[model samples]
Target: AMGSMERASLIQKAKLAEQAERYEDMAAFMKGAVEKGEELSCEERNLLSVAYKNVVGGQRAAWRVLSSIEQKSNGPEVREYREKVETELQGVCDTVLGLLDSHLIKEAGDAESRVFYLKMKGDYYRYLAEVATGDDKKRIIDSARSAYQEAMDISKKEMPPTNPIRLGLALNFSVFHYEIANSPEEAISLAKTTFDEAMADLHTLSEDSYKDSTLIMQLLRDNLTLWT
Candidate 1:
C-alpha cells in the first residue's frame, strides 16, 4: 500500500527530528507509527516514551512501557536511560498514600490546622481515584467522599454554621454526590445554598473563600447543564 510508503517517510523523518532536538514532531509521528504498526526498536521506543513528557498522556504511557521491562538485564547503557525515564515518571505521579492516615491521627487534637488535615484526607483519596481502574475507581471515590463528609462533621462540631471553611468543605463535597452517586439535584441545591450563605458576607470570607466558591461554581456550570 502507498500508505506504508507514506508512513515510512514519516517514521524516518521522526527519528531525524528526534535526534535534532525536535521532540514535539518526533513524538507525534511515533504515535502515528503506532497506528502504522511500525516495529519500534529499543531506541525508538525510548524516544517515543520520552515524547510523552511535557504533555498529558505521555507519562502514563511511559510508566506503562517502562514498568514491564527488565532493566537489570538490559545493556548497561540502556539501563541508564530506563532509570532516567522512571525518575521522570515518578516525579510527576503520586508517590505514596498510606502514611497520611497515621499523620492525621497524630494531629487529631491539634489546633486550627486540624480542619485542614481533615480536608486533605478527602483530597488524598481523590488522587487515588485517578490512577485506579475498574472497582478500585469506585472504591477510592467513595473513600474520598467519606473523608470529606467526616471533615465537614468534625468541623461542624468545632465551628459555627456560617464558618467559611465548613461551607467550603460542604461545597467541595457536592461533586461526589453527583458524579459517584448521580445526584445532580443535590449537587445543584447544595451549591446554591452554601454559595448563597458564604457570599452573604463576601468581603468577610477567609483567604480561601474565592477559590472554593469559584471551584464550586465552575463545577455547577460544567455539569448542571450537561447531565441535567
Candidate 2:
C-alpha cells in the first residue's frame, strides 16, 4: 500500500496525522514520502522537520532541513511552514527548562542527578539565550553561568576530588563562559584557563577510571581552538 500511493501523497497523510496530534506518526509518513521523491519544496521539508522536533526535544532534526534551504522560500505556504517551525522551536526553551525543573523535584533524588540537572538547565537557558533579546539575553546568560558553576561545585564536593565528571563539568562551564564573553580577548582568557584547569585535574585519567571520556576532552580541544 505504501508503494502504491503517489510518492508525494504521504505528505497529505502526514498533514492528517498532524491534525490528529500524532506527531511521530506524521514524521514517519513525511520521511516515507521524502524517500520516494525528488528534492522537497521548502514547505514540505519544514513540515517534516517540525514533526520530528515536536516529538523529540531539540533542533537536531529541524536544522537538517533549515540548513539546506540556501535561499529562504518566500511563498505563502513556505512562510506559513517557517512560521510554524519558529513557533515550535521558540517553545522548546521553556519546554526543556520545565522538564529540568521536574527532574529536580523528583522523589528519587541524588546529588549526581542534581548536578546533571543543573548542567541541562544551563544548556536549556543557553539554547534560549541564542535568540533572547536585550535584558533577557543577559539574564539568561547569567542564569546559565550560575547553573554551570554550581554544577562544577557540586561535582567537586559530591564526587571524589579527582572525579572525571568534575573535569567534564568544568569543560562545559568554561565553554559557556567563553561563548558568552563580549570580547574575543575575554573569551580566550576564560576558555584557556578553564581548559588548563580541567586538564590538570584530569591528568592520566582514562575511561576505565569511571567512564571513557577521552572523546569529551577531544571535543573541548576542538571548541577551544575556535574560541581562541
On TM-score, the leading prediction is 2
Q: Would you give me the overall lDDT of model 1?
A: 0.57
Q: List the candidate 1 regions with Cα displacement exceeding 4 Å.
A: 1-96, 161-164, 200-228
lDDT of 2 by residue, 46-67 (tens): 5655675566544635633653
Runs with alpha carbons beyond 4 Å of true place in candidate 2: 1-82, 103-109, 160-164, 181-190, 201-207
| Clashes (candidate 1) | 1
Error of 1 at 99 (Å): 4.0
Cα-based TM-score, every candidate = 0.46, 0.57
Cα error, residue 74 of model 1, in Å, equals 31
Predictions in order: lDDT: 0.57, 0.61
Cα lDDT of model 1 by residue, 1-228, tens digit: 224546767678777876786766775665566445534444554454455333324655564466456543544555565567656544333322332343433444632345554565565465445445688678878878777877777876786445645665675567666655566788777666665665564565565866655565555456556645
